[model samples]
Target: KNIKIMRLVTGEDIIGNISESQGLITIKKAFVIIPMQPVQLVLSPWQPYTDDKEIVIDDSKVITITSPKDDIIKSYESHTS
Candidate 1:
């Protein structure tokens, strides 16, 4: 599979307990992102006035790990000949 790279993305963040707090015990961070590489796509909170450690990802703060940052994962690249 000739691929370039991939990342994880989410629509929102989950906060508060479910089933007991409100509806069924389920909290969706919205659209989940499964990246091909070990990367984290921190996204903004979906709901307002909610407690979500990971801040919303919309022209605010979004860190992307690719290329060298991608290969450096686990510092495996450190093992050189």
Candidate 2:
């Protein structure tokens, strides 16, 4: 019921509040993971163009779903809060 990581078929990693229903996956307060040269993980807004905080994607677009590390979960919580 907390933060989870979703790997998209497009090869992007997103972390957020995840839920599914009726063939759709909903990601609230989504953030895309960006790796830096120093091996640091950065979270950027998944969809910066839109005002909507919740992003809905078709289930087919998701390649895998898993839990994030404790550090990442902490980072996400700090960012969202």
Candidate 3:
């Protein structure tokens, strides 16, 4: 699965299917991982108003990319599928 978690320089944690090319990384069906009180996590659309499913960010703006926890991946799949 291409689903993964990305940490941005602005400190937002985003989860999505990521593809990297040249100096850009394209994230499909991206969601922001919102941390809530009582140690709960929620997913919110990264771009709430757009009709586009893919969001592109410059590689320079990302701090790191890593696998998300299995449960989070499952949640993403359930929502996007």
Candidate 4:
């Protein structure tokens, strides 16, 4: 599978591979390597935020995790540079 761009509800963006269970999402082998590694989290409000290798994010906190539109990604790259 291709790596995905995850845009979280908290204004964070993560690019990586994911594994899912009944109540959790495990994100590992992540990139944007300069700062964070892997992040994992829950699917709801009760989950705490952390800087650990695997961050437990609340699923409810997630708005959407989809590939950014081509124009959007390119536009982002153009500005960030």
Instruction: List TM-score per model, in order.
Output: 0.19, 0.93, 0.92, 0.47
For all candidates in order, the CA lDDT equals 0.29, 0.91, 0.91, 0.50
Identify the candidate with maximal TM-score.
Answer: 2
> Candidate 3: which stretches are off by over 4 Å?
none
lDDT of 2 by residue, 1-81 (tens): 568899999999999998898999988999999998846999999999999977899989999999998999999999987
Residue 80 local lDDT, model 1 = 17
Q: Cα lDDT for residue 7, model 4?
A: 69
Model 2 clash pairs? Answer: none
| Candidate 4 lDDT by residue in tens digits, 1-81 | 344566677676665555556667666544331233344321221223544455555567666677755654443344332
Q: Could you tell which candidate, 3 or 4, scores higher by lDDT? A: 3
Candidates in descending lDDT order: 2, 3, 4, 1
RMSDs, each prediction? Answer: 14.1, 1.1, 1.1, 10.8
Worst 10 residues of 1 by lDDT: 15-24
Of the pair 1 and 2, which is ahead by lDDT? 2
Name the TM-score of candidate 3: 0.92
Candidate 2 colliding pairs, count: 0
Candidate 1 vs candidate 3, lDDT winner = 3
